[PDB]
Amino acid sequence: MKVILLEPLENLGDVGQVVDVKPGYARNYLLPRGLAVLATESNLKALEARIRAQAKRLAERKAEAERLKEILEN
RNA sequence: AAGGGGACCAGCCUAAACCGUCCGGCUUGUCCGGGCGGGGUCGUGGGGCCCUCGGACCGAAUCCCCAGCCUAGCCGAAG
Ligand SMILES: [Mg+2]
Ligand SMILES: [Mg+2]
Ligand SMILES: [Mg+2]
Ligand SMILES: [Mg+2]
Ligand SMILES: [Mg+2]
Ligand SMILES: [Mg+2]
Ligand SMILES: [Mg+2]
Ligand SMILES: [Mg+2]
Ligand SMILES: [Mg+2]
Ligand SMILES: [Mg+2]
Ligand SMILES: [Mg+2]
Ligand SMILES: [Mg+2]
Ligand SMILES: [Mg+2]
Ligand SMILES: [Mg+2]
């Protein structure tokens, strides 16, 4: 069973990673402990949506630097 | 059972893509979900979206009217 880690987990994976676990481990441990969520298509895109936002919002912060950098230093 | 001969005769609505819209969620958005409306319904495959061309017939199983029919009856020849 594929799930999306919501946390870093020992020898499983880092947050946002999609890994294969036994259906039982997910159903009766991971899911009700909020440590992960099932790797369905509905929230697969919802995952990608925020990787994308985090991607954009990061590079906007870098663009602000180079604008501020080229202004000063020159 | 197919086939042949007859009785009767009729074909339709959706799901999904895509658009809209109201709400809900916090994992903040080009988000996810639930409603609702639009769209679409096919096997020669059909539909969706993007270009080019073209701009009235058909009609209900629903509703309305009516005829007819039913639920009482009546006239009816000649010792
Ligand atoms: Mg037959
Ligand atoms: Mg026959
Ligand atoms: Mg026929
Ligand atoms: Mg519809
Ligand atoms: Mg909706
Ligand atoms: Mg709909
Ligand atoms: Mg419709
Ligand atoms: Mg329609
Ligand atoms: Mg239609
Ligand atoms: Mg064919
Ligand atoms: Mg086609
Ligand atoms: Mg009809
Ligand atoms: Mg009499
Ligand atoms: Mg008499």
d(CA A39, CA A44): 6
Question: Which residues numbered 21-60 in chain A sit less than 7 A from strand B, measured from CB?
Answer: 37, 42-43, 45-47, 49-50, 52-54, 57
Elucidated via: X-ray
CA of A21 to C1' of B62 (A): 57
- Where b means 16+ CB within 10 Å and e means fewer, A26-58 reads beeebeeeebbbbbeeeeeeeeeeeeeeeeeee
d(CA A51, CA A16): 9
Provide the 10 A C-beta neighbour count for residue A9.
15
Tell me, in Å, the resolution of the deposited structure.
2.4
